[PDB]
Paper text:
Here we show how myeloperoxidase (MPO), a highly expressed neutrophil protein, disassembles nucleosomes, thereby facilitating NET formation, yet also binds stably to NETs extracellularly. We describe how the oligomeric status of MPO governs both outcomes. MPO dimers interact with nucleosomal DNA using one protomer and concurrently dock into the nucleosome acidic patch with the other protomer. On the other hand, MPO monomers stably interact with the nucleosome acidic patch without making concomitant DNA contacts, explaining how monomeric MPO binds to and licences NETs to confer hypohalous acid production in the extracellular space.
The MPO dimer–nucleosome complex was refined to resolutions of between 3.1 Å and 3.9 Å and revealed that nucleosome disassembly might depend on how the MPO dimer binds to it. One of its protomers binds to the acidic patch as observed above for the monomer and rMPO. Notably, the second protomer of the dimer binds more peripherally and contacts the nucleosome predominantly along the DNA. This interface is characterized by charge complementarity between arginines of MPO and the negatively charged DNA backbone without specific, dominant single contacts. Importantly, the 12 most terminal nucleotide pairs on one of the DNA ends are disordered in the structure bound by dimeric MPO compared with the other structures, in which these nucleotide pairs are ordered. This DNA end is in close proximity to the second MPO protomer and a superposition revealed a clash of dimeric MPO with the histone-bound conformation that the DNA adopts in complex with monomeric MPO and rMPO, respectively. Thus, the MPO dimer displaces one of the ends of the DNA, destabilizing the nucleosome. For dimeric MPO, this specific and probably tight binding positions the second MPO protomer to interact with the DNA at the crossover site, resulting in a clash of this MPO protomer with the nearby end of the nucleosomal DNA. To compensate for this clash, the DNA end can no longer associate with the nucleosome and unwraps, ultimately destabilizing the nucleosome enough to trigger its disassembly. Essentially, the MPO dimer induces molecular constraints and shifts the dynamic equilibrium of nucleosomes towards detachment of the DNA, driving nucleosome eviction.
Numbering used by the authors:
A (entry chain B): 23 to 101
B (entry chain L), G (entry chain N): 113 to 578
C (entry chain K), F (entry chain M): 1 to 104
D (entry chain A): 38 to 135
E (entry chain G): 66 to 117
């Protein structure tokens, strides 16, 4: 299960271009993959905790929204 | 080459020509008298024609104290050392002060009443003698200055006449600025335009140009759409005051005898406070009192105020509607459909297209007053932009702004923050029941009226010098 | 201009210590856009008959007021959120700010 | 053989992707990664489509902001090339790895 | 947001217009500082040093 | 002025159809910032002795040129990436653009 | 009072006062003559004083055709219908045309060297008489116009004089615009400043003001820092031309006799092309030739160009250095240290502090030329901002811009994009070896000089009328 490589180098390059980055080093992609993995781990852990507390086997959008809001990353558009 | 009697288009006369089938003027040979504004420097073929502003652009209550040294000196009471302003030596309003009479060779005031023989009034501005509401305002401000000087003399007996005059004038100017920028402009522009064009005050830019724009003198005439066709007078119970409770506006122009011999300024102030204004609608712009019978008594023929506005805009050489929409960063319509979408009234767009032929040729006043009003506002986006820019420049570019450091002390600023036009009306008149906060919104008696004693008073103890 | 002053001058001078004539009385207006006259500098539009503005004839001001501004008085709509005090203070503030003199 | 400069197409992409609102990461790989990560906390988990969409939006916004901060850090060091030390410094100052 | 949509020659308000309205206003940006708007994009801004 | 034209007017009139004066010859300059005169409108700084600008005395232009501008000619360095053609074309362009007349 | 001979401060004289211990003027009661610029409209106590621009602000090669109807009519070759420009009727440069002679009551050119008695040249500007390089430029442009008219007549025999003259003038103006905005301005502002202030051309704003700013007339004098103290002449082999290969600049002011009697304009153009300009440095601003001996031969006393610039900036009422830094959105220093960091020079900042006292009082020219030069540019950020703004307004506000739609056909624009100043030089002079591309950057022989049979010529085939 190696799915962190699913975030390809062109995708990271596109995300950097949206951020105004002109030139990218070759070692940036691994660092970005690690940062994304850490962020997703935290958010998903909080969402799964919220889901278990609700006695459910399905992760809903409200759980993710609450998990993001708990981290000071309020997200608008999903409830 | 007298413009008020001759219709020949010779300078400085720029008469208005009568279109065919005019409802009021049946003779095309006649015309509306009109005077071109004085050029900045006459006879110059090199400079583009520009107009002169005869008053200080700052909000410094120059309508009470004047903008020229001889007039300002003549407006004061030099018979003493209390620093008061001159008051009427012949008439009083129930024992209260009245504006001094003014001596002009051609006085329109005695033309309305040839029996009263009451001349025009003397104030900081020569237009103070139109119409009894404005005269009531001028008298109220005069009384307020006199009362402030009296209280300051009571607090500081060591101060001389010049010091009393200067301090009272400072307080009156600060009061005018506070009332204008706290009660009036939010209602004019609306919260969106107020926040966009007049942000929080920070400090004094000396780099901001405080001059009055040429377009502002024609964009601020949006108030001609708020004019009611009557003058209302109310008694102590805010009931119609007999006789003549509702007087046509054509019978009040340049009529100071109504202020003098008809009960003073208290009924006029009550009517101003307790009467709704006129809403500006795209099919109801200006009443016929100012459109057909303006200055009828004092002139050979009635004037047309909107027509005068647009003819003055043409005389001043102002750009068209599209140029000012581009100036303010707004989309500029080009066809009848785009103009209808912008104006939200398609029939008005057809009428404007028929009259002018292109949106670029629409006069600034007409396009400004034909636009839909902003939410919680009374001007269109273009007029709101112009007015907000001008007042932001007048506020940030003023060195003696009351909030600027060094002008008023912190205690003085906090004391001035407690003022209100209702309190001034309570203090300087015999009116005991007065509308609540935001006097420009309360208009129905007795739902939004309180007793005069509940209004906090201005505490001048911070002005004591020791 | 005096180095120190406590109060405004009546004529409005010396308010801006860099350009003392800014905002004073008896001074020319400031133009936010270049002027648009018939001949370019002095003649207003509609002075000479037959001259068009931007390829279109200039409408008479009285005709525009007759066609658009005119409306029956009896259909006047009162303002439930404003009073005549609003309009009166507007006129008073306007007389505070500006005045364009004309020849006698 | 018209070849652009090594900086023209980068600026073109910067202008193109700063004017759009789409998602820059393919949806299926991100969904697979999210499921693989969630496998570490609770087995036999079901995901709503809106949940995965919200996770993707939050991750993309976080990465874009981090890359803006990283660009600021790189410009501070008199450079135009984005390097991992810039990311580490930005994360420290933000308070994430601090 | 409606002003932003009009500036883009659009009839409807989409989340992009909401993001443009929020991020271009200093006080609204301060209020919604830690808030992410879905499908809002980012403000077009390129650093000066990166320009040719 | 004519609605349709094919060539420039020698004076510059009606280049801008809305405001024909804009850009023409024998016309006043535009002001990006308000003028700063000694008396406010006409007198230059340094006219009447003893009047200070921004609280500081007005320096003589010749004194400033003597102190700061002056440098030994023999220590002149040439521009390796420019020629005198650069400054000559600059002067020609300046003479194309503007010329402020003075009384005889 | 004659400002040339007197030293009193009466209008319209604004003489320069001599500081104590002047290195050249040992008499403190003496003065440097100075004339105040003509006001826009004189004698007015209302309008703020403004100056007059006597030329068209557009880049239309008005230095060759003139900005007034009578001068333009006098400058033409009206003896026939070939649409040519008037040439000199007494002297020729090896069979080539010369500028027509002028007729002035007082002729500065005659004073320079009286035996020849050669008056000033007549052209589209009154200042072409100064400088043999400038006279060479004017002669080259006149020859180019004549050649263009001849070629157009050859292609289209049916065209009359007026059409030929107008078309040749159009092509000359387009060439001037191309050379200015493609070769000169990038070398002035630099890459980043050119990109910031002069982006790619899009279309024609009629809402952009094309007027020349008052500050621009003083800011564009940065070229006084690029003036070499001598005049150079190289022969066909690009070797010094005997006699007088290196003549002091004080002997060439209004010395048109040198142009007429010393080899024409070919050696002058060779010297311009094959010599390096002076580098502007914070301690090497301006040379002594224009600092002590300006107009030495014609005037009673040598003028001083930088002091003239400062006195003109004061005469025009221009704001100070800090005001223009604020205008361009740049930080405004207030102390000696802040000015030192701004200028990257603590000693120069200290000298400026001692001379002026505050950065708010530093003249626009002095502060602008004291700033460090931009990368690959020749101006500081403030001067770059002012110049870029002015030229952007000139380009966007010009209806007859060469890239504007409807001015030229696509084939005509394609042909015009190939022009270059070295090509003009070869077509209109006898020089057979000219500098490479970007003549403003190539200054070394024979490295940067090529045979100009290799430079493509302008193709007029697209101008043929079918
Ligand atoms: C053709 O050019 C037109 C003019 O172009 C000018 O010159 C060229 C060479 C460029 O430098 C260009 O940038 C110049 O503007 C151009 O129309 C111009 O459009 C701009 C942007 O919409 C207008 O600016 C807006 O003006 C008003 C008022 O503010 C100004 O005036 C007051 C008083 O003088 C000053 O105090 C201000 O500082 C400004 O100078 C405002 O509505 C607005 O500011 C507010 O709004 C914006 C967004 O709405 C906010 O970001 C701000 O913070 C404010 O809240 C703008 O400043 C400009 O007036 C207008 N010029 C003219 C002469 O009408 C046009 O777009 C070009 N055409 C094309 C097709 O590109
Ligand atoms: C005190 O106020 C000063 C003036 O304030 C003005 O009036 C008040 C009431 C407000 O409306 C305020 O917004 C107004 O600006 C203020 O100084 C002002 O600072 C601005 C921003 O620095 C200056 O604008 C810059 O000007 C130049 C030139 O462009 C202008 O002029 C030309 C010619 O008229 C026009 O064609 C243009 O459209 C502009 O109008 C430029 O250098 C610059 O634009 C470029 O640079 C910026 C980066 O700095 C980029 O973002 C732009 O895209 C451009 O690349 C600015 O437009 C303004 O000239 C200046 N005004 C004056 C009178 O000096 C000051 O900041 C206030 N002080 C404090 C402490 O608050
Ligand atoms: C009794 C009330 C009023 C009278 C007699 C009156 C009449 C006039 C007349 C005849 C003019 C000259 C031509 C012109 O309109 O441009 C004028 C100008 C003007 N009006 Fe009014 N109007 C009244 C109400 C108002 C109101 C309510 C406002 C604003 C809220 C206003 C604002 C102005 C301004 C700013 C001017 C410019 C001054 C000038 O050009 O001399 N007026 N007024
Ligand atoms: C041989 C070359 C030059 C001569 C004889 C010369 C001389 C002069 C003189 C006498 C003035 C008027 C002084 C004053 O009004 O204060 C002047 C102004 C001026 N100069 Fe020069 N200068 C030369 C080089 C340059 C260069 C290289 C440039 C630009 C690149 C330039 C640009 C200007 C401008 C724009 C003016 C303003 C016109 C005016 O003030 O009336 N000059 N020059
Ligand atoms: C001046 O004030 C006194 C009271 O101090 C009053 O009696 C007198 O009438 C006033 N004079 C004028 C001209 O207003
Ligand atoms: C004129 O004033 C007198 C009082 O002096 C009054 O009786 C009369 O009615 C007035 N005239 C009109 C027409 O209002
Ligand atoms: C006009 O051109 C002809 C032919 O080139 C020439 O001989 C003549 O001298 C010119 N006239 C003038 C006045 O320069
Ligand atoms: C003046 O002109 C004559 C030619 O007529 C020339 O020989 C002489 O050298 C010139 N004078 C100077 C001082 O150069
Ligand atoms: Ca005032
Ligand atoms: Ca020109
Ligand atoms: Cl205006
Ligand atoms: Cl200026």
């Amino acid at each position: 299960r190696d799915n962190i490589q699913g975030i390809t180098k062109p995708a990271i390059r596109r995300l950097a271009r949206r951020g105004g980055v002109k030139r990218i080093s070759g070692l940036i992609y691994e660092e970005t993959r690690g940062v994304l993995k850490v962020f997703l781990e935290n958010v998903i852990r909080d969402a799964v905790t919220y889901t278990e507390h609700a006695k459910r086997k399905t992760v809903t959008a409200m759980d993710v929204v609450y998990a993001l809001k708990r981290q000071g990353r309020t997200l608008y558009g999903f409830g | 080459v007298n413009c008020e009697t001759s219709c020949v288009q010779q300078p400085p006369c720029f008469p208005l020509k009568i279109p065919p089938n005019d409802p009021r003027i049946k003779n095309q040979a006649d015309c509306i008298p009109f005077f071109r504004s004085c050029p900045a420097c006459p006879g110059s073929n090199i400079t583009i024609r520009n107009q002169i502003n005869a008053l200080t652009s700052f909000v410094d209550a120059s309508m009470v104290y004047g903008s020229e040294e001889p007039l300002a000196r003549n407006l004061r009471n030099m018979s003493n050392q209390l620093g008061l302003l001159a008051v009427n030596q012949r008439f009083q309003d129930n024992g209260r002060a009245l504006l001094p009479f003014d001596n002009l060779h051609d006085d329109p005031c005695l033309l309305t009443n040839r029996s009263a023989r009451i001349p025009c009034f003397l104030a900081g501005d020569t237009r103070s003698s139109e119409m009894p509401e404005l005269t009531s305002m001028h008298t109220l401000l005069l009384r307020e200055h006199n009362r402030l000087a009296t209280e300051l003399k009571s607090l500081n007996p060591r101060w001389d006449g010049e010091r009393l005059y200067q301090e009272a004038r400072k307080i009156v100017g600060a009061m005018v600025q506070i009332i204008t920028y706290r009660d009036y402009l939010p209602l004019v522009l609306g919260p969106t335009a107020m926040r966009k064009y007049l942000p929080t005050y920070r400090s004094y830019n000396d780099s901001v140009d405080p001059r009055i724009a040429n377009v502002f003198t024609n964009a601020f005439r949006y108030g001609h759409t708020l004019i009611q066709p009557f003058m209302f007078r109310l008694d102590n119970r805010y009931q119609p005051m007999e006789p003549n409770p509702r007087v046509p506006l054509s019978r009040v122009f340049f009529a100071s005898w109504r202020v003098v011999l008809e009960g003073g300024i208290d009924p006029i102030l009550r009517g101003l406070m307790a009467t709704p204004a006129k809403l500006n609608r795209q099919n109801q712009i200006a009443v016929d009192e100012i459109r057909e019978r303006l200055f009828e008594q004092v002139m050979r023929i009635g004037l047309d105020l909107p027509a005068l506005n647009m003819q003055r805009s043409r005389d001043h050489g102002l750009p068209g509607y599209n140029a000012w929409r581009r100036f303010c960063g707004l989309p500029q319509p080009e066809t009848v459909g785009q103009l209808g979408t912008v104006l939200r009234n398609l029939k008005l767009a057809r009428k404007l297209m028929e009259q002018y032929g292109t949106p670029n040729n629409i006069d600034i006043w007409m396009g400004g007053v034909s636009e839909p009003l902003k939410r919680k506002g009374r001007v269109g986006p273009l007029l709101a932009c112009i007015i907000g820019t001008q007042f932001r420049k007048l506020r940030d570019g003023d060195r003696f702004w009351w909030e600027n450091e060094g002008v008023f002390s912190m205690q003085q600023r906090q004391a001035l923050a407690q003022i209100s036009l209702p309190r001034i009306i309570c203090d300087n008149t015999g009116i005991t029941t007065v509308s609540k906060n935001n006097i420009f919104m309360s208009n129905s008696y007795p739902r939004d009226f309180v007793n005069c004693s509940t209004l906090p008073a201005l505490n001048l103890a911070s002005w004591r010098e020791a | 201009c005096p180095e120190q002053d406590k109060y405004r001058t009546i004529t409005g001078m010396c308010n801006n210590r860099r350009s003392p004539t800014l905002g004073a009385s008896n001074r020319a207006f400031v133009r936010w856009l270049p002027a648009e006259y018939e001949d370019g500098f002095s003649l207003p539009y509609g002075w000479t008959p037959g001259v068009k503005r931007n390829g279109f004839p200039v409408a008479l001001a009285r005709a525009v007021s007759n066609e658009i501004v005119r409306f029956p008085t009896d259909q006047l709509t009162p303002d439930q959120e404003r009073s005549l005090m609003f309009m009166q203070w507007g006129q008073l503030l306007d007389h505070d700010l500006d005045f364009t003199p004309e020849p006698a | 053989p018209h070849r652009y400069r090594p900086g023209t197409v980068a600026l073109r992409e910067i202008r193109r992707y700063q004017k759009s609102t789409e998602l820059l990461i393919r949806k299926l790989p991100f969904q697979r990664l999210v499921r693989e990560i969630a496998q570490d906390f609770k087995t036999d988990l079901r995901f709503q489509s809106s949940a995965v969409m919200a996770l993707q939006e939050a991750s993309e916004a976080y990465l874009v902001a981090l890359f803006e901060d990283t660009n600021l850090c790189a410009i501070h060091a008199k450079r135009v090339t984005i390097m991992p030390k810039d990311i580490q410094l930005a994360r420290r100052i933000r308070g994430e790895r601090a | 947001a409606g002003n932003a949509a009009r500036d883009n020659k659009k009839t409807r308000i989409i989340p992009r217009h909401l993001q443009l309205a929020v991020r271009n206003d200093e006080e609204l940006n301060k209020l919604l500082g830690r808030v992410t708007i879905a499908q809002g994009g980012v403000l077009p801004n390129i650093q000066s040093v990166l320009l040719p």
